[PDB]
Tab-separated table of N, CA, C and O in Angstrom:
chain	number	residue	atom	x	y	z
A	1	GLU	N	4.105	-0.327	13.467
A	1	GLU	CA	5.114	0.711	13.800
A	1	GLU	C	6.486	0.274	13.272
A	1	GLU	O	6.812	-0.914	13.338
A	2	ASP	N	7.284	1.227	12.770
A	2	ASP	CA	8.576	1.061	12.087
A	2	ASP	C	8.518	0.118	10.876
A	2	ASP	O	8.499	0.579	9.734
A	3	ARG	N	8.414	-1.195	11.103
A	3	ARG	CA	8.134	-2.193	10.071
A	3	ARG	C	6.620	-2.202	9.816
A	3	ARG	O	5.917	-3.163	10.142
A	4	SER	N	6.113	-1.093	9.272
A	4	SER	CA	4.726	-0.959	8.827
A	4	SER	C	4.622	-1.182	7.312
A	4	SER	O	3.707	-1.864	6.850
A	5	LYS	N	5.588	-0.671	6.530
A	5	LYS	CA	5.617	-0.804	5.063
A	5	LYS	C	6.273	-2.108	4.598
A	5	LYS	O	6.726	-2.193	3.458
A	6	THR	N	6.344	-3.106	5.476
A	6	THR	CA	6.970	-4.396	5.237
A	6	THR	C	6.441	-4.989	3.925
A	6	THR	O	5.226	-5.115	3.729
A	7	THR	N	7.358	-5.305	3.014
A	7	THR	CA	7.058	-5.793	1.678
A	7	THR	C	6.454	-7.205	1.721
A	7	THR	O	6.645	-7.955	2.684
A	8	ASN	N	5.718	-7.561	0.666
A	8	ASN	CA	5.157	-8.899	0.456
A	8	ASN	C	5.875	-9.495	-0.744
A	8	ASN	O	6.085	-8.792	-1.739
A	9	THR	N	6.221	-10.776	-0.649
A	9	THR	CA	6.855	-11.525	-1.723
A	9	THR	C	5.937	-12.687	-2.072
A	9	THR	O	5.348	-13.306	-1.186
A	10	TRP	N	5.856	-13.018	-3.357
A	10	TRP	CA	5.098	-14.137	-3.882
A	10	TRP	C	5.998	-14.886	-4.850
A	10	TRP	O	6.883	-14.281	-5.453
A	11	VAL	N	5.771	-16.181	-5.023
A	11	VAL	CA	6.392	-16.970	-6.072
A	11	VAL	C	5.303	-17.379	-7.064
A	11	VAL	O	4.179	-17.689	-6.664
A	12	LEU	N	5.633	-17.367	-8.357
A	12	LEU	CA	4.766	-17.815	-9.436
A	12	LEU	C	5.512	-18.879	-10.209
A	12	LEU	O	6.562	-18.585	-10.777
A	13	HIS	N	4.966	-20.088	-10.262
A	13	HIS	CA	5.465	-21.125	-11.144
A	13	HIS	C	4.661	-21.019	-12.441
A	13	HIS	O	3.444	-21.222	-12.416
A	14	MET	N	5.309	-20.647	-13.550
A	14	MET	CA	4.669	-20.417	-14.839
A	14	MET	C	5.633	-20.840	-15.945
A	14	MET	O	6.822	-20.539	-15.869
A	15	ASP	N	5.123	-21.528	-16.971
A	15	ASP	CA	5.875	-21.955	-18.161
A	15	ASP	C	7.191	-22.676	-17.817
A	15	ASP	O	8.225	-22.497	-18.469
A	16	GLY	N	7.160	-23.487	-16.751
A	16	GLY	CA	8.302	-24.272	-16.285
A	16	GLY	C	9.338	-23.463	-15.493
A	16	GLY	O	10.288	-24.052	-14.970
A	17	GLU	N	9.172	-22.145	-15.367
A	17	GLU	CA	10.024	-21.249	-14.605
A	17	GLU	C	9.372	-20.923	-13.259
A	17	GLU	O	8.179	-21.161	-13.057
A	18	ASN	N	10.158	-20.374	-12.332
A	18	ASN	CA	9.689	-19.811	-11.075
A	18	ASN	C	10.115	-18.349	-11.039
A	18	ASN	O	11.303	-18.046	-11.172
A	19	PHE	N	9.145	-17.455	-10.851
A	19	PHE	CA	9.343	-16.012	-10.771
A	19	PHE	C	9.079	-15.571	-9.341
A	19	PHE	O	8.057	-15.950	-8.769
A	20	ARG	N	9.960	-14.763	-8.753
A	20	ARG	CA	9.714	-14.101	-7.480
A	20	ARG	C	9.120	-12.738	-7.799
A	20	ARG	O	9.675	-12.016	-8.626
A	21	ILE	N	8.033	-12.373	-7.138
A	21	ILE	CA	7.420	-11.060	-7.182
A	21	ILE	C	7.676	-10.460	-5.815
A	21	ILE	O	7.407	-11.139	-4.830
A	22	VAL	N	8.105	-9.209	-5.729
A	22	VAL	CA	8.169	-8.476	-4.485
A	22	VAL	C	7.485	-7.144	-4.759
A	22	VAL	O	7.892	-6.414	-5.660
A	23	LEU	N	6.437	-6.823	-4.004
A	23	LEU	CA	5.852	-5.483	-4.036
A	23	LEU	C	6.596	-4.628	-3.019
A	23	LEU	O	6.610	-4.969	-1.834
A	24	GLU	N	7.164	-3.510	-3.461
A	24	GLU	CA	7.692	-2.472	-2.607
A	24	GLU	C	6.540	-1.522	-2.301
A	24	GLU	O	6.033	-0.837	-3.194
A	25	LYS	N	6.103	-1.471	-1.042
A	25	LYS	CA	5.003	-0.601	-0.630
A	25	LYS	C	5.467	0.847	-0.537
A	25	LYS	O	4.628	1.745	-0.546
A	26	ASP	N	6.783	1.086	-0.461
A	26	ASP	CA	7.324	2.431	-0.300
A	26	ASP	C	6.964	3.321	-1.494
A	26	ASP	O	6.668	4.507	-1.311
A	27	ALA	N	6.933	2.730	-2.698
A	27	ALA	CA	6.616	3.395	-3.950
A	27	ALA	C	5.440	2.749	-4.706
A	27	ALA	O	5.087	3.242	-5.780
A	28	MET	N	4.832	1.674	-4.171
A	28	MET	CA	3.860	0.847	-4.898
A	28	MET	C	4.468	0.414	-6.243
A	28	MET	O	3.872	0.569	-7.313
A	29	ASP	N	5.700	-0.103	-6.174
A	29	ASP	CA	6.489	-0.551	-7.317
A	29	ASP	C	6.741	-2.043	-7.154
A	29	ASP	O	6.928	-2.504	-6.028
A	30	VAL	N	6.727	-2.817	-8.233
A	30	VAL	CA	6.737	-4.273	-8.141
A	30	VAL	C	7.938	-4.807	-8.909
A	30	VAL	O	8.073	-4.613	-10.121
A	31	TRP	N	8.801	-5.503	-8.179
A	31	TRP	CA	9.953	-6.219	-8.670
A	31	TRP	C	9.521	-7.618	-9.108
A	31	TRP	O	8.874	-8.319	-8.332
A	32	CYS	N	9.878	-8.044	-10.318
A	32	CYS	CA	9.753	-9.418	-10.773
A	32	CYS	C	11.182	-9.866	-11.075
A	32	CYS	O	11.867	-9.235	-11.884
A	33	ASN	N	11.656	-10.903	-10.375
A	33	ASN	CA	13.046	-11.378	-10.410
A	33	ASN	C	14.049	-10.219	-10.252
A	33	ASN	O	15.062	-10.152	-10.947
A	34	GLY	N	13.749	-9.280	-9.343
A	34	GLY	CA	14.646	-8.187	-8.966
A	34	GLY	C	14.652	-6.987	-9.921
A	34	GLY	O	15.246	-5.963	-9.579
A	35	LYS	N	13.979	-7.056	-11.078
A	35	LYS	CA	13.815	-5.920	-11.995
A	35	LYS	C	12.411	-5.367	-11.793
A	35	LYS	O	11.479	-6.160	-11.666
A	36	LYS	N	12.213	-4.042	-11.754
A	36	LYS	CA	10.847	-3.530	-11.668
A	36	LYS	C	10.136	-3.711	-13.005
A	36	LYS	O	10.779	-3.638	-14.057
A	37	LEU	N	8.826	-3.941	-12.959
A	37	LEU	CA	7.951	-4.019	-14.121
A	37	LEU	C	6.905	-2.905	-14.074
A	37	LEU	O	6.771	-2.196	-13.073
A	38	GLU	N	6.202	-2.725	-15.189
A	38	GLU	CA	5.182	-1.702	-15.354
A	38	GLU	C	3.936	-2.064	-14.542
A	38	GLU	O	3.577	-3.238	-14.437
A	39	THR	N	3.259	-1.053	-14.001
A	39	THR	CA	2.084	-1.207	-13.148
A	39	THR	C	1.080	-0.085	-13.436
A	39	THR	O	1.471	1.026	-13.810
A	40	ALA	N	-0.207	-0.370	-13.229
A	40	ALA	CA	-1.289	0.606	-13.229
A	40	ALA	C	-2.093	0.361	-11.959
A	40	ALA	O	-2.339	-0.795	-11.623
A	41	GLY	N	-2.475	1.418	-11.244
A	41	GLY	CA	-3.158	1.325	-9.963
A	41	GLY	C	-4.617	1.657	-10.211
A	41	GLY	O	-4.972	2.835	-10.295
A	42	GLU	N	-5.446	0.631	-10.387
A	42	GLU	CA	-6.869	0.797	-10.575
A	42	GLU	C	-7.539	0.853	-9.202
A	42	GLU	O	-7.105	0.167	-8.274
A	43	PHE	N	-8.604	1.638	-9.076
A	43	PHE	CA	-9.372	1.764	-7.844
A	43	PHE	C	-10.745	1.139	-8.062
A	43	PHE	O	-11.392	1.380	-9.087
A	44	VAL	N	-11.184	0.334	-7.099
A	44	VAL	CA	-12.386	-0.476	-7.168
A	44	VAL	C	-13.184	-0.344	-5.873
A	44	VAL	O	-12.671	0.126	-4.852
A	45	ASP	N	-14.427	-0.827	-5.905
A	45	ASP	CA	-15.345	-0.874	-4.764
A	45	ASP	C	-14.979	-2.042	-3.831
A	45	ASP	O	-15.790	-2.914	-3.504
A	46	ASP	N	-13.693	-2.108	-3.500
A	46	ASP	CA	-13.012	-3.198	-2.810
A	46	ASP	C	-11.702	-2.688	-2.192
A	46	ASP	O	-11.343	-3.074	-1.078
A	47	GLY	N	-11.011	-1.772	-2.877
A	47	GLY	CA	-9.693	-1.296	-2.506
A	47	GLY	C	-8.975	-0.855	-3.775
A	47	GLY	O	-9.566	-0.164	-4.610
A	48	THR	N	-7.729	-1.289	-3.951
A	48	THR	CA	-6.925	-0.977	-5.122
A	48	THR	C	-6.548	-2.302	-5.780
A	48	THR	O	-6.423	-3.326	-5.104
A	49	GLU	N	-6.344	-2.290	-7.091
A	49	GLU	CA	-5.846	-3.408	-7.861
A	49	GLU	C	-4.694	-2.877	-8.710
A	49	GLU	O	-4.900	-2.118	-9.659
A	50	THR	N	-3.464	-3.227	-8.335
A	50	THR	CA	-2.279	-2.845	-9.092
A	50	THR	C	-2.090	-3.898	-10.177
A	50	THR	O	-1.600	-4.984	-9.876
A	51	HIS	N	-2.506	-3.603	-11.406
A	51	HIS	CA	-2.485	-4.526	-12.533
A	51	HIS	C	-1.109	-4.521	-13.201
A	51	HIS	O	-0.471	-3.466	-13.280
A	52	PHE	N	-0.679	-5.682	-13.703
A	52	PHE	CA	0.491	-5.870	-14.559
A	52	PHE	C	0.331	-7.190	-15.334
A	52	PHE	O	-0.679	-7.877	-15.182
A	53	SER	N	1.316	-7.567	-16.151
A	53	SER	CA	1.337	-8.826	-16.891
A	53	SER	C	2.779	-9.321	-16.995
A	53	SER	O	3.714	-8.515	-17.020
A	54	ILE	N	2.956	-10.641	-17.064
A	54	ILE	CA	4.233	-11.331	-17.196
A	54	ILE	C	3.988	-12.364	-18.296
A	54	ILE	O	3.190	-13.288	-18.115
A	55	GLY	N	4.621	-12.184	-19.457
A	55	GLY	CA	4.303	-12.971	-20.641
A	55	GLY	C	2.823	-12.793	-20.980
A	55	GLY	O	2.315	-11.668	-21.000
A	56	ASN	N	2.121	-13.907	-21.209
A	56	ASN	CA	0.690	-13.914	-21.508
A	56	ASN	C	-0.181	-13.800	-20.244
A	56	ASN	O	-1.397	-13.635	-20.351
A	57	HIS	N	0.408	-13.924	-19.047
A	57	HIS	CA	-0.335	-14.024	-17.796
A	57	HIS	C	-0.564	-12.615	-17.259
A	57	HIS	O	0.406	-11.905	-16.983
A	58	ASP	N	-1.819	-12.196	-17.093
A	58	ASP	CA	-2.127	-10.954	-16.386
A	58	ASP	C	-2.186	-11.223	-14.883
A	58	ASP	O	-2.562	-12.317	-14.439
A	59	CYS	N	-1.784	-10.222	-14.110
A	59	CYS	CA	-1.615	-10.275	-12.674
A	59	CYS	C	-2.158	-8.989	-12.071
A	59	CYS	O	-2.119	-7.939	-12.717
A	60	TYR	N	-2.615	-9.025	-10.823
A	60	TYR	CA	-2.908	-7.809	-10.103
A	60	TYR	C	-2.655	-8.020	-8.623
A	60	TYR	O	-2.957	-9.089	-8.097
A	61	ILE	N	-2.108	-7.027	-7.927
A	61	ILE	CA	-2.054	-7.078	-6.472
A	61	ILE	C	-3.359	-6.453	-6.012
A	61	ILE	O	-3.592	-5.271	-6.266
A	62	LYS	N	-4.214	-7.246	-5.378
A	62	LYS	CA	-5.399	-6.763	-4.695
A	62	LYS	C	-4.873	-6.155	-3.409
A	62	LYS	O	-4.128	-6.817	-2.689
A	63	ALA	N	-5.227	-4.913	-3.135
A	63	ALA	CA	-4.896	-4.218	-1.916
A	63	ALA	C	-6.241	-3.806	-1.333
A	63	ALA	O	-6.788	-2.759	-1.675
A	64	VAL	N	-6.818	-4.691	-0.532
A	64	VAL	CA	-8.182	-4.602	-0.045
A	64	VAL	C	-8.195	-3.706	1.182
A	64	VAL	O	-7.514	-4.025	2.154
A	65	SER	N	-8.979	-2.635	1.197
A	65	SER	CA	-9.142	-1.768	2.358
A	65	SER	C	-10.114	-2.416	3.365
A	65	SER	O	-11.181	-1.873	3.662
A	66	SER	N	-9.768	-3.616	3.838
A	66	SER	CA	-10.597	-4.424	4.723
A	66	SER	C	-10.643	-3.843	6.142
A	66	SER	O	-11.651	-4.005	6.835
A	67	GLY	N	-9.583	-3.154	6.582
A	67	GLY	CA	-9.566	-2.446	7.857
A	67	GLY	C	-10.586	-1.303	7.860
A	67	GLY	O	-10.809	-0.653	6.835
A	68	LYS	N	-11.212	-1.053	9.016
A	68	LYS	CA	-12.187	0.034	9.168
A	68	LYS	C	-11.484	1.396	9.243
A	68	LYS	O	-12.048	2.407	8.819
A	69	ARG	N	-10.257	1.430	9.778
A	69	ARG	CA	-9.415	2.628	9.800
A	69	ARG	C	-8.924	2.928	8.374
A	69	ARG	O	-9.119	2.139	7.447
A	70	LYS	N	-8.210	4.048	8.208
A	70	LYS	CA	-7.547	4.422	6.951
A	70	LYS	C	-6.339	3.540	6.604
A	70	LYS	O	-5.661	3.798	5.611
A	71	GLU	N	-6.031	2.538	7.426
A	71	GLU	CA	-4.940	1.591	7.251
A	71	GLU	C	-5.453	0.180	7.579
A	71	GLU	O	-6.608	0.021	7.992
A	72	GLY	N	-4.608	-0.840	7.400
A	72	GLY	CA	-5.026	-2.236	7.501
A	72	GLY	C	-5.510	-2.749	6.143
A	72	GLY	O	-6.595	-3.322	6.035
A	73	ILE	N	-4.734	-2.475	5.088
A	73	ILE	CA	-5.027	-2.876	3.720
A	73	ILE	C	-4.418	-4.278	3.559
A	73	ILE	O	-3.231	-4.467	3.840
A	74	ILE	N	-5.197	-5.261	3.099
A	74	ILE	CA	-4.743	-6.636	2.915
A	74	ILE	C	-4.170	-6.709	1.505
A	74	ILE	O	-4.891	-6.423	0.552
A	75	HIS	N	-2.894	-7.065	1.366
A	75	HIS	CA	-2.244	-7.185	0.070
A	75	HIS	C	-2.190	-8.660	-0.325
A	75	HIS	O	-1.665	-9.480	0.433
A	76	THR	N	-2.668	-8.979	-1.528
A	76	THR	CA	-2.624	-10.322	-2.099
A	76	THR	C	-2.270	-10.213	-3.573
A	76	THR	O	-2.787	-9.334	-4.253
A	77	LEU	N	-1.439	-11.110	-4.099
A	77	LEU	CA	-1.222	-11.201	-5.533
A	77	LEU	C	-2.282	-12.122	-6.112
A	77	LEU	O	-2.494	-13.214	-5.599
A	78	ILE	N	-2.933	-11.702	-7.184
A	78	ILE	CA	-3.815	-12.504	-8.000
A	78	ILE	C	-3.109	-12.644	-9.356
A	78	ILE	O	-2.500	-11.685	-9.835
A	79	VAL	N	-3.208	-13.806	-10.003
A	79	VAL	CA	-2.713	-14.054	-11.349
A	79	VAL	C	-3.750	-14.903	-12.068
A	79	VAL	O	-4.244	-15.867	-11.487
A	80	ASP	N	-4.107	-14.543	-13.303
A	80	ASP	CA	-5.156	-15.208	-14.088
A	80	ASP	C	-6.461	-15.369	-13.284
A	80	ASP	O	-7.149	-16.387	-13.356
A	81	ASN	N	-6.784	-14.359	-12.461
A	81	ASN	CA	-7.906	-14.319	-11.512
A	81	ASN	C	-7.863	-15.379	-10.388
A	81	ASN	O	-8.840	-15.529	-9.649
A	82	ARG	N	-6.753	-16.111	-10.217
A	82	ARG	CA	-6.507	-17.007	-9.094
A	82	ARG	C	-5.705	-16.276	-8.039
A	82	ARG	O	-4.914	-15.394	-8.361
A	83	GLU	N	-5.890	-16.655	-6.783
A	83	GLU	CA	-5.260	-16.011	-5.647
A	83	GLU	C	-3.936	-16.708	-5.315
A	83	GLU	O	-3.880	-17.939	-5.269
A	84	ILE	N	-2.886	-15.917	-5.066
A	84	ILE	CA	-1.520	-16.353	-4.801
A	84	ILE	C	-1.159	-15.862	-3.384
A	84	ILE	O	-1.080	-14.648	-3.172
A	85	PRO	N	-0.944	-16.756	-2.401
A	85	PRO	CA	-0.541	-16.370	-1.050
A	85	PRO	C	0.938	-15.949	-1.021
A	85	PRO	O	1.740	-16.423	-1.832
A	86	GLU	N	1.302	-15.057	-0.092
A	86	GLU	CA	2.689	-14.629	0.093
A	86	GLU	C	3.545	-15.821	0.564
A	86	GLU	O	3.024	-16.842	1.033
A	87	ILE	N	4.866	-15.694	0.432
A	87	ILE	CA	5.822	-16.752	0.746
A	87	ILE	C	5.774	-17.158	2.228
A	87	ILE	O	5.446	-16.353	3.105
A	88	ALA	N	6.149	-18.414	2.491
A	88	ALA	CA	6.187	-19.022	3.820
A	88	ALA	C	7.560	-19.643	4.126
A	88	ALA	O	7.678	-20.601	4.898
A	89	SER	N	8.588	-19.106	3.472
A	89	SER	CA	9.980	-19.513	3.608
A	89	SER	C	10.451	-19.293	5.051
A	89	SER	O	11.169	-20.170	5.585
């Protein structure tokens, strides 16, 4: 309730840099270092996979419809098919 669309942030250490990813759930739009990047929302026998790429690295936000209700979607960033947990700052 109220804070239901609460955003997820991830950090990616790649090519000696650190990139912050923030998914805005309000628009399903993804900020990388505060600039939005291009996205495609693929649908799978799992949930949704919002695909994008940063340099040579392909990325997708897995949005798993793990909840039995129409809500309770688990959001995770995957990069190079490895799983990236949200920040713990």
